[PDB]
Ligand binder design. Structure first.
Ligand code: SAH
Length: 261
């Protein structure tokens, strides 16, 4: 019905080998080697990001889709990729990250990247039941993908319901992941939330073509329905492909080391 639902149907109908070739074609991918060697060798000093999510956030902060500052609350922090990146920025003074944890959910990693003394991560916290607290910058990177777009719709709306109780607290910088932004219920909800709190949808090139995630960021603007559709166009055009040239590889940036005031 929507262009994103046609992509989802086409995606579900792919073969296992076509799936692999399509999921990384033309996407931007960072180096994870220094992160994976230090992640055994005890090197919490290397400055190598703990996850790919770190490079996804730098992509938006550098293009000023979001400008972290003050107290940052990181819902669904996982290993802490967004938390340790935000701790390097000058405007940021405190980073509080929450994540579910338990079996099958990522546990926060303790690292000594630049500004690590400002990061406090607490695992074992289901965000759907945690009360909101005052903050200046709101992150939320939650959304478990599924072959059913109907499942993703219910998971996306539940997230968008939860984050609004945090946005009513006044933060004006925010970066919230929309797992399934092409379903009609999600589009209507986003227009309502965009009216009340602002922002807009953006697609990060480091995302994989195997999912339609887009981020509701405070520094974006414009028609939400169209921004989703033009992303749905690129993804479908990447499925119809003969010359599979693969991904554009890039280097991550070093987070640094040491304490901040
Ligand atoms: N109800 C819930 N409450 C809290 N955390 C949740 C959750 N549902 C999923 N999660 C957690 O959200 C995390 C998304 S991982 C996001 C990557 C992170 N920004 C980084 O840069 O490293 C997952 O680890 C998941 O365990």
């Amino acid at each position: 019905r929507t262009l994103g639902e046609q992509w989802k149907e086409k995606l579900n109908g792919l073969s296992k080998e076509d799936f692999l070739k399509y999921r990384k074609e033309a996407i931007t991918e960072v180096d994870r080697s220094a992160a994976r060697k230090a992640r055994r060798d005890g090197n919490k000093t290397g400055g190598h990001p703990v996850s790919r999510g770190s490079a996804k956030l730098r992509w938006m902060v550098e293009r000023q889709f979001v400008k972290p500052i003050g107290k940052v609350v990181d819902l669904g922090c996982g290993r802490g990729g967004w938390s340790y990146y935000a701790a390097t920025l000058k405007g940021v003074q405190e980073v509080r990250g929450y994540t579910k944890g338990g079996p099958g959910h990522e546990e926060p990693m303790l690292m000594q990247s630049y500004g690590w003394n400002l990061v406090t991560m607490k695992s074992g916290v289901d965000v759907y039941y945690k009360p909101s607290e005052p903050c200046d910058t709101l992150f939320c990177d939650i959304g478990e993908s599924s072959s059913s777009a109907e499942v993703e719709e219910q998971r996306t709306l539940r997230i968008l319901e939860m984050v609004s109780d945090w946005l009513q607290r006044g933060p004006r910088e925010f970066c919230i992941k929309v797992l399934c932004p092409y379903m009609p219920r999600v589009m209507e909800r986003l227009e309502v939330l965009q009216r009340r709190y602002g922002g807009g949808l953006v697609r990060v090139p480091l995302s994989r073509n195997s999912n339609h995630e887009m981020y509701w960021v405070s520094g974006a603007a414009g028609n939400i329905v169209h921004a989703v559709n033009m992303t749905s166009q690129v993804l479908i055009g990447r499925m119809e492909k003969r010359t599979w040239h693969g991904p554009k590889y890039e280097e991550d940036v070093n987070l640094g080391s040491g304490t901040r005031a």
